[PDB]
Design a protein around this motif. Sequence first.
Motif, PDB file in Angstrom:
ATOM      1  N   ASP A   1     -33.071 -33.905  -9.699  1.00 43.59           N
ATOM      2  CA  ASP A   1     -31.666 -34.239  -9.898  1.00 43.59           C
ATOM      3  C   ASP A   1     -31.031 -33.350 -10.963  1.00 43.59           C
ATOM      4  OD1 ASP A   1     -32.642 -36.155  -8.242  1.00 43.59           O
ATOM      5  OD2 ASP A   1     -32.085 -37.878  -9.485  1.00 43.59           O
ATOM      6  N   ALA A   2     -30.901 -32.064 -10.655  1.00 41.54           N
ATOM      7  CA  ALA A   2     -30.333 -31.102 -11.585  1.00 41.54           C
ATOM      8  C   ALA A   2     -28.840 -30.924 -11.335  1.00 41.54           C
ATOM      9  CB  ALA A   2     -31.044 -29.752 -11.472  1.00 41.54           C
ATOM     10  N   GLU A   3     -28.122 -30.543 -12.389  1.00 38.06           N
ATOM     11  CA  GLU A   3     -26.687 -30.290 -12.312  1.00 38.06           C
ATOM     12  C   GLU A   3     -26.393 -28.952 -12.973  1.00 38.06           C
ATOM     13  OE1 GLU A   3     -24.227 -33.443 -13.700  1.00 38.06           O
ATOM     14  OE2 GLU A   3     -25.280 -35.012 -12.584  1.00 38.06           O
ATOM     15  N   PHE A   4     -25.846 -28.017 -12.201  1.00 38.91           N
ATOM     16  CA  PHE A   4     -25.515 -26.679 -12.682  1.00 38.91           C
ATOM     17  C   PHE A   4     -23.999 -26.561 -12.767  1.00 38.91           C
ATOM     18  CE2 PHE A   4     -29.557 -26.671 -10.631  1.00 38.91           C
ATOM     19  CZ  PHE A   4     -30.364 -25.810 -11.347  1.00 38.91           C
ATOM     20  N   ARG A   5     -23.483 -26.399 -13.983  1.00 36.62           N
ATOM     21  CA  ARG A   5     -22.051 -26.270 -14.222  1.00 36.62           C
ATOM     22  C   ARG A   5     -21.798 -25.012 -15.038  1.00 36.62           C
ATOM     23  NH1 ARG A   5     -18.111 -30.267 -17.829  1.00 36.62           N
ATOM     24  NH2 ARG A   5     -16.149 -29.165 -17.385  1.00 36.62           N
ATOM     25  N   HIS A   6     -20.917 -24.147 -14.538  1.00 39.09           N
ATOM     26  CA  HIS A   6     -20.553 -22.914 -15.223  1.00 39.09           C
ATOM     27  C   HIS A   6     -19.038 -22.807 -15.300  1.00 39.09           C
ATOM     28  CE1 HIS A   6     -21.356 -18.743 -16.617  1.00 39.09           C
ATOM     29  NE2 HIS A   6     -20.160 -18.525 -16.099  1.00 39.09           N
ATOM     30  N   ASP A   7     -18.530 -22.452 -16.479  1.00 38.31           N
ATOM     31  CA  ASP A   7     -17.107 -22.241 -16.695  1.00 38.31           C
ATOM     32  C   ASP A   7     -16.910 -20.915 -17.413  1.00 38.31           C
ATOM     33  OD1 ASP A   7     -14.396 -22.554 -16.740  1.00 38.31           O
ATOM     34  OD2 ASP A   7     -14.362 -24.174 -18.222  1.00 38.31           O
ATOM     35  N   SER A   8     -16.039 -20.066 -16.868  1.00 41.82           N
ATOM     36  CA  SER A   8     -15.804 -18.740 -17.427  1.00 41.82           C
ATOM     37  C   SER A   8     -14.784 -18.735 -18.560  1.00 41.82           C
ATOM     38  CB  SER A   8     -15.354 -17.776 -16.327  1.00 41.82           C
ATOM     39  OG  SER A   8     -16.350 -17.637 -15.330  1.00 41.82           O
ATOM     40  N   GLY A   9     -14.244 -19.889 -18.940  1.00 41.08           N
ATOM     41  CA  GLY A   9     -13.370 -19.977 -20.089  1.00 41.08           C
ATOM     42  C   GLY A   9     -11.934 -19.587 -19.787  1.00 41.08           C
ATOM     43  N   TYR A  10     -11.089 -19.757 -20.801  1.00 34.48           N
ATOM     44  CA  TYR A  10      -9.661 -19.486 -20.707  1.00 34.48           C
ATOM     45  C   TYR A  10      -9.368 -18.130 -21.339  1.00 34.48           C
ATOM     46  CZ  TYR A  10      -9.111 -24.442 -19.527  1.00 34.48           C
ATOM     47  OH  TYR A  10      -9.196 -25.678 -18.928  1.00 34.48           O
ATOM     48  N   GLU A  11      -8.760 -17.231 -20.567  1.00 32.87           N
ATOM     49  CA  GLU A  11      -8.451 -15.882 -21.027  1.00 32.87           C
ATOM     50  C   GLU A  11      -6.943 -15.680 -21.013  1.00 32.87           C
ATOM     51  OE1 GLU A  11      -8.758 -12.106 -18.897  1.00 32.87           O
ATOM     52  OE2 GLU A  11     -10.668 -11.777 -19.929  1.00 32.87           O
ATOM     53  N   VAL A  12      -6.373 -15.405 -22.183  1.00 35.19           N
ATOM     54  CA  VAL A  12      -4.957 -15.082 -22.326  1.00 35.19           C
ATOM     55  C   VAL A  12      -4.854 -13.709 -22.977  1.00 35.19           C
ATOM     56  CG1 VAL A  12      -2.741 -15.754 -23.290  1.00 35.19           C
ATOM     57  CG2 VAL A  12      -4.349 -17.510 -22.520  1.00 35.19           C
ATOM     58  N   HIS A  13      -4.148 -12.791 -22.319  1.00 37.14           N
ATOM     59  CA  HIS A  13      -3.977 -11.428 -22.806  1.00 37.14           C
ATOM     60  C   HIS A  13      -2.497 -11.090 -22.896  1.00 37.14           C
ATOM     61  CE1 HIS A  13      -8.250  -9.758 -21.697  1.00 37.14           C
ATOM     62  NE2 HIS A  13      -8.278 -10.701 -22.619  1.00 37.14           N
ATOM     63  N   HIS A  14      -2.062 -10.658 -24.077  1.00 37.98           N
ATOM     64  CA  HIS A  14      -0.713 -10.150 -24.296  1.00 37.98           C
ATOM     65  C   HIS A  14      -0.826  -8.707 -24.766  1.00 37.98           C
ATOM     66  CE1 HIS A  14       3.649 -10.645 -25.212  1.00 37.98           C
ATOM     67  NE2 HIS A  14       3.384  -9.684 -26.078  1.00 37.98           N
ATOM     68  N   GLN A  15      -0.278  -7.781 -23.981  1.00 39.18           N
ATOM     69  CA  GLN A  15      -0.452  -6.358 -24.227  1.00 39.18           C
ATOM     70  C   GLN A  15       0.869  -5.631 -24.024  1.00 39.18           C
ATOM     71  OE1 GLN A  15      -3.489  -6.308 -21.257  1.00 39.18           O
ATOM     72  NE2 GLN A  15      -5.108  -5.714 -22.694  1.00 39.18           N
ATOM     73  N   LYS A  16       1.184  -4.727 -24.950  1.00 33.67           N
ATOM     74  CA  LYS A  16       2.393  -3.918 -24.875  1.00 33.67           C
ATOM     75  C   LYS A  16       2.059  -2.499 -25.303  1.00 33.67           C
ATOM     76  CE  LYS A  16       7.200  -3.634 -26.473  1.00 33.67           C
ATOM     77  NZ  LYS A  16       8.247  -4.271 -27.317  1.00 33.67           N
ATOM     78  N   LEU A  17       2.517  -1.521 -24.516  1.00 34.20           N
ATOM     79  CA  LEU A  17       2.273  -0.103 -24.785  1.00 34.20           C
ATOM     80  C   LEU A  17       0.775   0.197 -24.858  1.00 34.20           C
ATOM     81  CD1 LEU A  17       5.115   0.843 -27.308  1.00 34.20           C
ATOM     82  CD2 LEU A  17       4.742   1.792 -25.028  1.00 34.20           C
ATOM     83  N   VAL A  18       0.042  -0.266 -23.850  1.00 34.15           N
ATOM     84  CA  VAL A  18      -1.399  -0.064 -23.758  1.00 34.15           C
ATOM     85  C   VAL A  18      -1.671   0.896 -22.610  1.00 34.15           C
ATOM     86  CG1 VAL A  18      -3.613  -1.130 -23.253  1.00 34.15           C
ATOM     87  CG2 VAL A  18      -2.014  -2.256 -24.804  1.00 34.15           C
ATOM     88  N   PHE A  19      -2.277   2.042 -22.924  1.00 32.58           N
ATOM     89  CA  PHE A  19      -2.546   3.040 -21.894  1.00 32.58           C
ATOM     90  C   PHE A  19      -3.508   2.501 -20.841  1.00 32.58           C
ATOM     91  CE2 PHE A  19      -5.143   6.539 -20.243  1.00 32.58           C
ATOM     92  CZ  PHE A  19      -4.160   7.311 -19.656  1.00 32.58           C
ATOM     93  N   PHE A  20      -4.674   2.025 -21.266  1.00 34.41           N
ATOM     94  CA  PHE A  20      -5.701   1.538 -20.346  1.00 34.41           C
ATOM     95  C   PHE A  20      -6.148   0.153 -20.794  1.00 34.41           C
ATOM     96  CE2 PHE A  20      -9.450   1.097 -17.880  1.00 34.41           C
ATOM     97  CZ  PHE A  20      -9.320   1.950 -16.803  1.00 34.41           C
ATOM     98  N   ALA A  21      -5.670  -0.874 -20.097  1.00 37.63           N
ATOM     99  CA  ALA A  21      -6.108  -2.248 -20.302  1.00 37.63           C
ATOM    100  C   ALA A  21      -7.006  -2.645 -19.141  1.00 37.63           C
ATOM    101  CB  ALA A  21      -4.916  -3.198 -20.413  1.00 37.63           C
TER     102      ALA A  21
END
Lengths: 38, 38, 38, 38, 38, 38, 38, 38, 38, 38
Positions: free
Chosen positions: D1-21
């Motif tokens: 009776d195993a339970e596998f739970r994975h969460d990749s989390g909350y990602e918030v990105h604020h970027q201005k004048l970024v050549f390579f994001a």
Amino acid sequence: DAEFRHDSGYEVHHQKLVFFAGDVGSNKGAIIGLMVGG
Amino acid sequence: DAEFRHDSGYEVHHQKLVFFAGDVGSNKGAIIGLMVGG
Amino acid sequence: DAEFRHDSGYEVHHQKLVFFAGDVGSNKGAIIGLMVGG
Amino acid sequence: DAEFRHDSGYEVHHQKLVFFAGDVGSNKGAIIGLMVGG
Amino acid sequence: DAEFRHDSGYEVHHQKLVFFAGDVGSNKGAIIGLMVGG
Amino acid sequence: DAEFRHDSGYEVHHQKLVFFAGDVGSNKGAIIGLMVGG
Amino acid sequence: DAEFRHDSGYEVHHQKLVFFAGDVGSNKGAIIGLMVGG
Amino acid sequence: DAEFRHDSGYEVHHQKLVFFAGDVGSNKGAIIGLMVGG
Amino acid sequence: DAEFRHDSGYEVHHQKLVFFAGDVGSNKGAIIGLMVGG
Amino acid sequence: DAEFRHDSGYEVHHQKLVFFAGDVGSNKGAIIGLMVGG
């Protein structure tokens, strides 16, 4: 009088029994070889 | 009179029985070879 | 009169029975060879 | 009776004048913001 | 009686004046913002 | 009249039965060879 | 009766005037902000 | 009339039964060979 | 009856005028802010 | 009846005018802020 020369080089790959051969830029999903439940 | 020369070199890869061969820029997901539950 | 020369060198890799062969820039996820529960 | 739970989390990105994001798994090419010759 | 649950999380991106927004798995070509010759 | 020359050297790697072969820039996730619970 | 829970955490990034924002798994190419020759 | 020459040297690695072969820039996560609970 | 819980923590980054923000797993190429020749 | 709990902690970074912000696992290439020749 500038000269811009770029070479990405010689790449030779020999692979056998490789689950995932390749480059992943970003990974947020699941990469599992085998899943057994119950 | 500048000269820009870039070479990425010679890459030879021999791999056998390799689960994950490759470069990951960023990893937030799950990379599991085998998952057994219950 | 400048000269810019860059060489990334010669890379030879021989790998057998390697779970994860490769370079990870950043790792926040889970990398597990084997998961057994219950 | 195993339970596998994975969460990749909350990602918030604020970027201005970024050549390579973004995340690059493997880079052998050229990434230049500006090239001027002659 | 196993339970496999995976969630890739919440991703919010705000970007302005970004040349390249995105993840590149492998790059061997040229990515240049501006090229001026002669 | 400057000359800039860079060489990354010769890299030879022979690896057998290696769980994780590679360089990690930053690690905040979990890297476990084997997980047994219950 | 095992329980596997993984969370990748909360990531907030605020970036302005950043040439390269992101994680590179492996870099053998050239990453130059500005190139001027001649 | 300056000359800049850099060489990263010759690297030969022979490794067998090595859990983690590689250089970690920063480590805040968990690196465990084997985890047994219950 | 084991319980495996992993949390990657809270990451907040504020960056301004940063050439390279990010983690590089392995670097064999050239990372130059500005190149002037001739 | 074991309990495994791991927390990577709270990371807050404030950076201004930083050439290279990030962790490098292995560095064999060239990282130069400014290159002037001739």
